[PDB]
Curated annotation (Swiss-Prot), chain A:
Sequence similarity: In the N-terminal section; belongs to the class V-like SAM-binding methyltransferase superfamily. In the C-terminal section; belongs to the mariner transposase family.
Gene: SETMAR
Highest taxon of the lineage: Eukaryota
Region (Mariner transposase Hsmar1): 1-206
Portion of the parent chain present: 451 to 684 of 684
Record note on what altering D53S does: Reduces activity in double-strand break repair
Binding site for Mg(2+): D46, D110
Modified residues (N6-methyllysine): K48
TM annotation in the entry: none
Subunit description: Homodimer. Interacts with PRPF19; required for SETMAR recruitment to damaged DNA sites. Interacts with PCNA. Interacts with TOP2A; stimulates TOP2A topoisomerase activity. May interact with RAD9A and/or RAD9B.
Free-text domain note: The mariner transposase Hsmar1 region mediates DNA-binding. It has retained some of the nucleases activity but has lost its transposase activity because the active site contains an Asn in position 610 instead of an Asp residue.
Name under which the protein is recorded: Histone-lysine N-methyltransferase SETMAR
Amino acid sequence: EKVKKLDKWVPHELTENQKNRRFEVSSSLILRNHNEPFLDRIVTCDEKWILYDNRHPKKVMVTIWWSAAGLIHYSFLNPGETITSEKYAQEIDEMNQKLQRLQRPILLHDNARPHVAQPTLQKLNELGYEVLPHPPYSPDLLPTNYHVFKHLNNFLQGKRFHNQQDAENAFQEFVESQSTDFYWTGINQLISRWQKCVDCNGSYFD
Amino acid sequence: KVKKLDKWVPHELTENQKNRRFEVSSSLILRNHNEPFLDRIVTCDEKWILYDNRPKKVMVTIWWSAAGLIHYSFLNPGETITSEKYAQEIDEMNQKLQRLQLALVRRKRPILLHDNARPHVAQPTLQKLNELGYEVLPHPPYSPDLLPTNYHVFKHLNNFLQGKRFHNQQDAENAFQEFVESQSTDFYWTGINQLISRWQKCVDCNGSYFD
């Protein structure tokens, strides 16, 4: 049985074992960061379906890569082209190129997805990326979902797009219209979130 | 399933079991490369000691670190460890750590490497580690080749226990004590400062076993 949390499908009631993994990771991150601060090294990412009609249907999947410094790279996935480990690998590799030019980094993302397989992992290892521990079923702890994609939504409400290029202009209008303070905030809010999780002994706190 | 290094690990790792082992080793190597953390590790695991060694048994637990033994403890037969008891165990282990460290310049903050797969690793245990400021290193399921206790200490034990029989628990226990006391401080350092190379191999082997 499932429920939608931050647009992501998640247990209608976490198991005891699922709250332990959340508490354990949250606790350790809070401690890690207090002793050896790393928030400012975090690169994070997720995907969101953008619906052509914001009141089956038609929609386009976007992927965004960002850090507290600001946006790094987003791309769109063409309708009917479900993404694979080897292209994600690609995505990663040019994400890294754009980053280098702005400028080791630490990646925070949902590791429990398909395109997160050997080629992908290979790429990150190869490129020198440490992946941050992340408890299963925890959208509340991924900044793209609790921050970025949430504000995107407020921006998307009541919008009808006709062509793909329109959606993309709405997204890109949105991301590009964002201050660096917007990204800085998404990331630096993590510590509070880890704490809030711990206090809830690993349950959802919002 | 099938036993490896004493513990029940599958015959074939599903493709992600091997992915997780890769994801962690890669990250741990990288993290250690950016900010060395080995010498802050405190590791521990549990092992049914057997009465004749070439059924009656006695479970032993050992906490240690690259600097030495910290604390070990036996569980009589018939007794099961409770998350609360384990929590108490941690609190005791911790107190020894600080006497051992009380000697130093700056204690740095301990990173526990241990098997969270156990069942007595639950809220009470988690609460205690948190309450004590203990970081917990990530650990891939079914990966005894990565816990030093299992691959280093417990291995050299089977190697000193072989062809030995005792007809009482105190006498088993006594054997263990004899062993760990005859280990010099850099026998422990070696179990720890060996992880890097063990992580790598897991990576070079794309998340599979390597011995």
